[PDB]
Design a protein around this ligand. Structure first.
Ligand SMILES: [Mg+2]
Lengths: 128, 292, 126, 110, 33
RNA sequence: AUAUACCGCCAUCUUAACCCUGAUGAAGGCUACAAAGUACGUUAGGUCAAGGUGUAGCCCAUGAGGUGGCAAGAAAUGGGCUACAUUUUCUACCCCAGAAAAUUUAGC
């Protein structure tokens, strides 16, 4: 668009509620695919998005698995693990929505979230 | 068949696509390179096919289409090369040059280029006997007192193979806080991994995981294995050894320690002695391991 | 003929043999069912069978090549390659019809991605 | 009719061409990309009608420019880690309990 | 089922439910070894 | 009962042109230190034990019961399972102690 541009845009309504935010110590994202190049492209995408949102990310590659069965057929499952650390509940929600909506076909995700909680008041002292 | 107009359109299409890809990836089109093209195509079109050629690729059209069809004469029809009518202008021109250089010289590790790669350089198919002719002329040029120009000319047709045996990397001689010189080295045998420190001076004390060597190795065979390195170079009772071994079993640990001590002791012996230990099999990692 | 006298265009998918499926060819359908830990692989296979039969009977003599069935979340994308022999009005009719039937038959948002070609893209001759 | 890549400028806004995940369109992607095992004295096939390029889960909708432009608009939704919790040493101090829970993203109707 | 369950209490590859589809690349992830 | 019904799963087998020579005859064309040569089906197959979709049979019996018996013998060879020790066995230790008593299969 050279001249015809939207004069103003309706930004979505994000409300700062009163309730306190969840805190995640760690957030491990394990993505599984049949293709290593697809997982590498997804890793590049997710890592760049993490940097652009300020999240702290580390990437490693769990060993692959190969299921053979019987003429001999074979199925390779390759893994990529993206460990985010020290992100709140809202950052986690928005980042996960982004990277799950942009999950390529044939790739599955397992997100393990490690929430930080305080002791219940009921356990602070023994009952007398 | 690809007409020159077709190839021209392919070149301009490729340049436009290059600038488009630079646009998409955010890179500067002016400095955008072929390696960048490869990386960007890999990212945008991921493909895990094992066949490297089968993946999507964006090459310059000359890389793709066979462009060996170079015209050998102009519009008037006169051929460019004075040996054109031989049909092997490249090969015979090269032979002529070699013969001329041999005439000039008369008036005054590595391997030979193979037949197929010589064809690739000449861009002309040639038989085996003419390849032999060329190689014998090159041999004659080598035997004569070939100068720097002739030397580089030969090197144009002499491929490189690297031989690097005889050379055991001699570990540096370090000094501990007490001012004593020592050298550290590692060894492996089956699943056993050993790391030994040999001291320049000593009284022949070996200490394995902090235990005397005769207490750590009750069997005489292992003690003989530990003895072999120092005995071979006639320096029993002249060095102290402090080694740490882990994994494996009795004989595997003894072999790992032997290898580590030999590689550490290579620092305190003469180069001739290092070569002798290499030939006695004392500096080689044994690769024999359990097969599935 | 005579007994010792004895002694067809093909596209890429037709040309290459089954043992090239991960070397030169790819997979027509792409989904998570066959991955390790995932479930419902058989249900996806049955869905794929029905889609292929339905599409081959709903676009007769139009499909130049085999379908590509992608799945992202609950989306179901049919990327088909068709010929330029049928009229575009009938193509639009059939796209709408097939999309709606498959959405109501699989309870998911199905969507369809025709790519017309002038004629079969022959790879070689066997 | 002619492909619309002929009308695409060399300095266009690519994200507007591929906003969301879409299949490869040889009439929309202005790249002379080729895919296929070449035949003897042949070349990898062109993109028009190529089923192999159609079978790739392409990332044309996620280019670096697009990713940065998305993550600049998504910053509105984010909150800030409490700076007091600089490392794990204080995370194990102020919040002794840790709760691990997992979600799974597959493809299907259910 | 539940009735029988309670009274008792008182007392080929099927993962896909194949060579055709697997050889024509119609089963995702399946390939020859 | 039938896959001697299909499906599935295994396995068997089969899968030209141009240029010269001979007087322009049938005809012939090589020498490198170079002398014409260059360009899927198949199967009375097995599998109804980690799986299906059908088809047939008997229906005073291929169903349901009752009364007795049945519980073998002998060789030559083929194969399999156990124990078979003094370089052994038991205890302490993990190796300097004390007590007990003919074909065939691999080779690398
Ligand atoms: Mg049978």
């Amino acid at each position: 668009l050279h001249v015809d541009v939207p004069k103003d845009l309706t930004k979505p309504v994000v409300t700062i509620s009163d309730e306190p935010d969840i805190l995640y110590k760690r957030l491990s994202v394990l993505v599984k695919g049949h293709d290593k190049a697809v997982l590498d492209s997804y890793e590049y995408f997710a890592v760049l998005a993490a940097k652009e949102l300020g999240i702290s990310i580390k990437v490693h590659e769990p060993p692959r698995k190969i299921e053979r069965f019987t003429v001999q057929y074979e199925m390779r499952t390759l893994y990529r693990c993206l460990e985010l650390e020290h992100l709140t509940g809202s950052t986690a929600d928005v980042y996960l929505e982004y990277i799950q909506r942009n999950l390529p076909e044939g790739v599955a995700m397992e997100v393990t979230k490690t929430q930080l909680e305080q002791l219940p008041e009921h356990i602070k002292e023994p009952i007398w | 068949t690809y007409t020159e107009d077709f190839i021209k359109k392919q070149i301009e299409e490729f340049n436009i696509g290059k600038r488009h890809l630079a646009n998409m990836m955010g890179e500067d089109p002016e400095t955008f390179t072929q390696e960048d093209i490869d990386r960007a195509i890999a990212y945008l079109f991921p493909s895990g096919l094992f066949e490297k050629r089968a993946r999507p690729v964006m090459k310059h059209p000359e890389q793709i289409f066979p462009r060996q069809r170079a015209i050998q004469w102009g519009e008037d029809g006169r051929p460019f090369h004075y040996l054109f009518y031989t049909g092997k202008q490249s090969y015979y021109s090269l032979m002529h040059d070699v013969y001329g250089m041999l005439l000039n010289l008369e008036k005054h590790g590595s391997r030979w280029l193979i037949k197929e790669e010589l064809e690739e350089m000449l861009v002309e198919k040639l038989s085996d006997l003419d390849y032999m002719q060329f190689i014998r002329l090159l041999e004659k040029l080598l035997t004569s007192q070939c100068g720097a120009a002739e030397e580089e000319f030969v090197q144009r047709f002499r491929r490189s193979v690297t031989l690097e045996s005889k050379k055991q990397l001699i570990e540096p001689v370090q000094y501990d806080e007490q001012g004593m010189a020592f050298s550290k080295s590692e060894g492996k045998r089956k699943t056993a991994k050993a790391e030994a420190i040999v001291y320049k001076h000593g009284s022949g004390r070996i200490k394995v995981n902090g235990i005397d060597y005769q207490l750590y190795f009750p069997i005489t065979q292992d003690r003989e294995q530990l003895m072999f390195p120092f005995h071979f170079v006639d320096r029993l009772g002249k060095h102290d050894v402090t080694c740490t071994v882990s994994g494996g079993g009795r004989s595997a640990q003894a072999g790992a320690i032997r290898l580590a001590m030999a590689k550490a002791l290579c620092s305190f012996v003469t180069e001739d002695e290092v070569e002798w230990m290499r030939q006695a099999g004392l500096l080689t990692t044994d690769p024999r391991v359990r097969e599935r | 003929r005579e007994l010792p006298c004895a002694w067809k265009p093909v596209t890429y998918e037709e040309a290459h043999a089954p043992h090239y499926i991960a070397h030169r060819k790819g997979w027509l359908s792409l989904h998570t069912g066959n991955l390790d830990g995932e479930d419902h692989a058989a249900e996806r296979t049955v869905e794929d069978v029905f889609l292929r039969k339905f599409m081959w009977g709903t676009f007769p003599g139009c499909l130049a090549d085999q379908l590509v069935l992608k799945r992202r979340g609950n989306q179901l994308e049919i990327c088909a390659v068709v010929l330029r022999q049928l009229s575009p009005h009938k193509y639009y009719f059939l796209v709408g019809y097939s999309e709606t039937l498959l959405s109501y038959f699989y309870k998911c948002p199905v969507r369809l991605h025709l790519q017309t070609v002038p004629s079969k893209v022959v790879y070689k001759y066997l | 009719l002619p492909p619309r890549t002929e009308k695409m400028a060399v300095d266009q806004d690519w994200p507007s061409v591929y906003p969301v995940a879409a299949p490869f369109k040889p009439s929309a992607v202005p790249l002379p990309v080729r895919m296929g095992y070449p035949v003897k004295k042949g070349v990898p096939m062109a993109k028009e009608g190529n089923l192999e390029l159609l079978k790739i889960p392409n990332f044309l909708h996620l280019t670096p420019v697009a990713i940065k432009k998305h993550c600049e608009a998504l910053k509105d939704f984010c909150t800030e880690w409490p700076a007091a919790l600089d490392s794990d040493e204080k995370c194990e101090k102020h919040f002794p309990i840790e709760i691990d829970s997992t979600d799974y993203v597959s493809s299907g109707p259910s | 089922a539940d009735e029988r369950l309670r009274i008792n209490s008182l007392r080929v590859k099927r993962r896909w439910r194949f060579r055709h589809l697997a050889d024509h690349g119609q089963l995702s992830g399946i390939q020859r070894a």
